[PDB]
Design a protein around this ligand. Structure first.
Ligand code: COH
Ligand code: COH
Ligand SMILES: *[C@@H]1O[C@H](CO)[C@@H](O[C@@H]2O[C@H](CO)[C@@H](O[C@H]3O[C@H](CO)[C@@H](O)[C@H](O)[C@@H]3O)[C@H](O)[C@H]2NC(C)=O)[C@H](O)[C@H]1NC(C)=O
Ligand SMILES: *[C@@H]1O[C@H](CO)[C@@H](O[C@@H]2O[C@H](CO)[C@@H](O)[C@H](O)[C@H]2NC(C)=O)[C@H](O)[C@H]1NC(C)=O
Ligand SMILES: CCCCCCCCO[C@@H]1O[C@H](CO)[C@@H](O)[C@H](O)[C@H]1O
Ligand SMILES: *[C@@H]1O[C@H](CO)[C@@H](O)[C@H](O)[C@H]1NC(C)=O
Ligand SMILES: *[C@@H]1O[C@H](CO)[C@@H](O)[C@H](O)[C@H]1NC(C)=O
Ligand SMILES: *[C@@H]1O[C@H](CO)[C@@H](O)[C@H](O)[C@H]1NC(C)=O
Ligand SMILES: *[C@@H]1O[C@H](CO)[C@@H](O)[C@H](O)[C@H]1NC(C)=O
Lengths: 551, 551
């Protein structure tokens, strides 16, 4: 079999076969050397003696409230710290990207073909004796058994951080602009050729689709008016392809950028909100530029909304997730004097870890009603019946589920959870511990260490036998969460670098774009720099209801 | 009309309309301020007093041979000097890219749509009172009249730098991998979506075309053997679409990566050489890795050949063009500690300036024959009759024409030269002096300063009236060349930043790629770092004839 099946090279050394039975490790710029890149240089010995654990840094940021409250009000000191946050792991993510599902070695095909998700770790070779390489049994445990024993929700477990349905649906809506799996090709392929925050889920992936969604007046998007309320246009009006079950009336077939957002009313809520925001900014821009035509109005509005999204994701969304007392800051200027690549390629593992199914509740509580999954799915009548105001007020109140900790995946999306496991194996993912080592984390030595618990650990032990063959996705869901937190260590240490790269890597954060002129002047620029989840709702939802990502 | 038509904003200031008759300049990070970004900051005033002129820096590099002899011999000093050259133009090139032919303002459509050539300067607005903005006459002079008076060749003017036909064909062959104009869409569109050195002119732009050219054995490309010599395969055998007149016999319809390379036997010479090189590398890699399969052998050979190209282009091709005594060096490690973006977008103006038609001779002298343009075009039988060895020996001896200095464009390519003028006007190029300021050059004050001569200057004066509305492309060809050089100032100061950006911006120059393991190990790595135009011919041409870019 392939000589690199056992993953011999440590510390991000690259493995290469030098024969049918022999491998070689490339230790270039790893800070290590030797046969397996395990012998540290003297400079490396120093760095390792002084590096604080991710648990220690998380403790500092989640304590000393009074101290951070002082820091958060000193602009110079806040910028300085946010600068460190953005640069404290400069080479975790490969940029330009390297491997994908079909290429465990670098190639021009892997680099140039945007239809692939990139890969943080190369796939396990096809001719390996065991699924994870050389360790474990001939076959991984039945994903059905893994699902039923440690993943499926018995009693509902609420998020201790108090995440609400506004947060859960925002997560779904935001991430599904760059998580668009091409199931015609396979789980390792994407339809999001932009590989980042381009707002294609609002404006459409292609120019053809964009032009069918546009009004071509005042730079605005097409819309309809139902009971005095502005909603997205219909499929019949725009000829925009949407995914709907056949029993859906044509007047309820709303057409938006993402073809699947008709699936859940929670997604149509944000789709409506963002559509209103686009047309709202067009009104502002037209007032600043009476001389501007439709095209420039539309494009500038798009850039501003891209800016608003990144602004919100960092200062409201990630801020809520982090649980830090330190106020994160969106400020591209912090990276101008730094080594940073303004480009991004979406990783397959970034998609996999973002399968936050436990976040979903048992029922969707709107106003006085408690809708089941069956009642809720593809039912935009619920949105028209209650309205955006009631949706926001209700979803702000309803708490979401805890992602880590185990046994909190709702029975409704059972097949989806099993698919995440199965497709991970299909894409030949390496084990949990390989991904932890890849992200400078210590490998788990036992299942009890992984779960911080005894019952599920024993279950996992009987299933996997070895901790070194434990899979990444199920581990993320059963991992011992941080104190009163929604996630475990692995989720954060993998998720965060992928996120900030995907946000700061946007071209509008590059120095030639980050100017008032790019956004139509100081007015358009300030729209971005003052944006929040609250203002987004206040400006576009009648009554201006209060909202947040916490209950 | 548009308020920015006069191009009021100086020093990379960005212009924006604020009313129907008012503009505003954005002087962000320009080092200037004021209404037109013309008032310099104090720190900026210092840098201006110290900055040496492009003429001065060129004088230093083309003189003091003894001082450069010492530098080239000591690797520490050579790397030090080359490091300065690679970082002398910090933000000359917008990366990520900005404008294109349809967008004179930053937009997501301009950034994400790879089918566009990007633009260093935005196009003149449609409703401007004159072709160049506000200056000049209602209409630019007739392009035929411009062509015939100052561009068309009277007597053949040989390049005083001694460039040969090996150079001229290498330039054409190499640059036509990223200069692939999509004439269906327009002159501002490209078919080279890789936007750089991907060797698509060898392997094909699309995976479909690539798979038709591949042998799928040992990683090699398909080929045929005629008279014991290795040539590319035919159109009939591969089903690869090529451009050939109907009368071309089946066996002379060679199939290569680029559809147009059958046009001239000089291009097929290099196409044949690179085809042999790929298969040669396959043989090397197969010996190193008996265990490797066809796919990995192909992909790794492609990465190696990409590296060879960049290596050769820098240390032989650009080295020749420069006329420097300093030996330019290809070493990606010199940028590892710098703020460099590993990405590229091909500029339309980079394409325009590379229309080096005057390079072409009156006849193509091979062995004892002197072929006319009519006889040379689409005639691969010439290549077979004389063979590769005679081609190299002959083209090494035949001198090419001078590009600058005026009146040296062969009448055979008359329509091509005029098309360069016409299409520049279609794409609404700004004037020569606007492009000189864009690249930190002093605007020409007269046509005599431009040509360093009186006769052509007088003809240009009558045709254009104002030096500030002189066009970019005709200026490059009539510009006063550097002393005993092939180019003028404007050609070098624009061409060099575009070239090095496209060469070093390649992903294989990034730290994660620039490793031995990427290229199959130290053996494959060495092939790149020892590559030369001489070694390319020596390894793949029978008899190993001497070759060079100078006669
Ligand atoms: C992050 C939060 C989140 C939420 C709130 C959420 C809420 C819901 C939801 C609510 C009613 C339903 C019915 C589903 C059901 C699905 N989800 Co999500 N999912 C989420 C994260 C994801 C992600 C990320 C993907 C990958 C999308 C892709 O690759 O196209 C996903 C994919 C899916 C798929 C694709 C099937 C497959 O084989 O991959 C289904 C079905 N699911 N999910
Ligand atoms: C760099 C040196 C170089 C050389 C030696 C060269 C030599 C020759 C040559 C020799 C026998 C012939 C027949 C041509 C003929 C052509 N060249 Co060039 N060309 C060169 C650089 C270019 C460039 C650059 C373009 C534009 C690329 C594009 O967009 O396709 C070009 C475009 C063309 C076109 C496109 C048609 C149009 O509408 O512009 C033709 C025809 N040509 N050229
Ligand atoms: C990159 O930009 C290209 C130029 O803008 C663009 O090509 C253009 O595509 C549009 C839509 O696909 C075509 O316009 C279409 O509009 C009518 C609607 O009334 C259709 O019915 C027509 O069939 C027509 O195709 C433009 O004709 C076309 N322009 C050119 C010069 O090709 C590309 O699609 C853009 N690329 C991406 C990936 O978006
Ligand atoms: C990116 O890679 C995919 C998968 O290799 C390519 O899709 C294949 O395209 C060929 C056409 O040459 C088809 O015959 C195959 O059926 C396709 N495979 C799949 C799984 O869809 C795709 O063409 C590549 N993209 C580019 C731009 O080359
Ligand atoms: C509290 C709801 C039951 C949780 C018990 C976890 C074990 C569930 O067990 C499984 O549940 C699936 C869906 O109910 C069924 O399709 C399977 O037949 C069943 O084996
Ligand atoms: C490297 O790892 C292999 C296991 O893959 C092991 O057999 C070998 O002893 C290791 N070498 C060193 C020097 O530790
Ligand atoms: C859709 O929601 C409405 C409430 O607005 C409800 O009356 C109806 O039964 C739902 N449809 C399904 C199929 O559950
Ligand atoms: C700016 O340029 C305009 C020409 O467009 C000129 O009239 C004006 O005086 C300039 N202003 C300054 C402050 O230089
Ligand atoms: C092609 O080249 C051959 C020499 O090999 C010459 O005899 C022939 O006339 C050429 N064809 C044309 C059409 O000029």
């Amino acid at each position: 079999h392939h000589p690199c099946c056992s993953n011999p090279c440590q510390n991000r050394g690259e493995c290469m076969s030098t024969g049918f039975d022999q491998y070689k490790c490339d230790c270039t710029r790893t800070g290590f050397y030797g046969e397996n890149c395990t012998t540290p240089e003297f400079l490396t010995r120093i760095k390792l003696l002084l590096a604080p654990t991710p648990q220690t840094v998380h403790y500092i940021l989640t304590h000393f409230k009074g101290v951070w409250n002082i820091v958060n009000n000193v602009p110079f000191l806040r910028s300085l710290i946010m600068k460190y946050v953005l640069t404290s792991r400069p080479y975790l993510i490969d940029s330009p990207p390297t491997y994908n599902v079909h290429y465990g070695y670098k190639s021009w095909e892997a680099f140039s073909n945007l239809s692939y998700y990139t890969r943080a770790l190369p796939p396990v070779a096809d001719d390996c004796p065991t699924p994870m390489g050389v360790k474990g049994n001939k076959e991984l445990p039945d994903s059905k058994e893994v699902l039923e024993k440690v993943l499926l929700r018995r009693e509902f477990i609420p998020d201790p951080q108090g995440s609400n349905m506004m947060f859960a649906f925002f997560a779904q809506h935001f991430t599904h602009q760059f998580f668009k799996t091409d199931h015609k090709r396979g789980p390792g392929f994407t339809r999001g050729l932009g590989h980042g925050v381009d707002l294609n889920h609002i404006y459409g992936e292609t120019l053809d689709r964009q032009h069918k969604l546009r009004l071509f007046k005042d730079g605005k998007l097409k819309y309809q008016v139902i009971g005095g309320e502005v909603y997205p246009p219909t499929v019949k009006d725009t000829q925009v392809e949407m995914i709907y079950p056949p029993h859906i009336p044509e007047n309820l077939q709303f057409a938006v950028g993402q073809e699947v957002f008709g699936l859940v009313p929670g997604l149509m809520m944000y789709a409506t909100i963002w559509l209103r925001e686009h047309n709202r900014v067009c009104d502002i821009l037209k007032q600043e530029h009476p001389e501007w035509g439709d095209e420039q109005l539309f494009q500038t509005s798009r850039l501003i909304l891209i800016g608003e999204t990144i602004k919100i994701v960092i200062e409201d969304y990630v801020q809520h997730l982090s649980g830090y007392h330190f106020k994160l800051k969106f400020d591209p200027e912090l990276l101008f004097n730094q080594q940073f690549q303004y480009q991004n390629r979406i990783a397959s593992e970034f998609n996999t870890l973002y399968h936050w199914h436990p976040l979903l509740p048992d029922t969707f509580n709107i106003e006085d009603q408690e809708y089941s999954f069956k009642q809720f799915l593809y039912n935009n009548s619920i949105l028209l019946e209650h309205g955006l105001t009631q949706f926001v007020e209700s979803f702000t109140r309803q708490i979401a589920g805890r992602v880590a900790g185990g046994r909190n995946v709702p029975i409704a999306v059972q097949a989806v959870a099993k698919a995440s496991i199965d497709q991970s194996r299909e894409m030949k993912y390496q084990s949990l511990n390989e991904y932890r080592k890849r992200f400078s984390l210590k490998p788990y030595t036992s299942f009890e260490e992984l779960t911080g618990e005894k019952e599920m650990a024993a279950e996992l032990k009987a299933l996997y036998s070895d901790i070194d063959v434990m899979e990444l996705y199920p581990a993320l869901l059963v991992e011992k969460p941080r104190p009163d937190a929604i996630f475990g260590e692995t989720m954060v240490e993998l998720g965060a670098p992928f996120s900030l790269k995907g946000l700061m890597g946007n071209p509008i954060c590059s120095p030639q774009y980050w100017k008032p002129s790019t956004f139509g002047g100081e007015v358009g620029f300030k729209i971005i720099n003052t944006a929040s989840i609250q203002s987004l709702i206040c400006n576009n939802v009648k009554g201006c209801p209060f909202t947040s990502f916490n209950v």
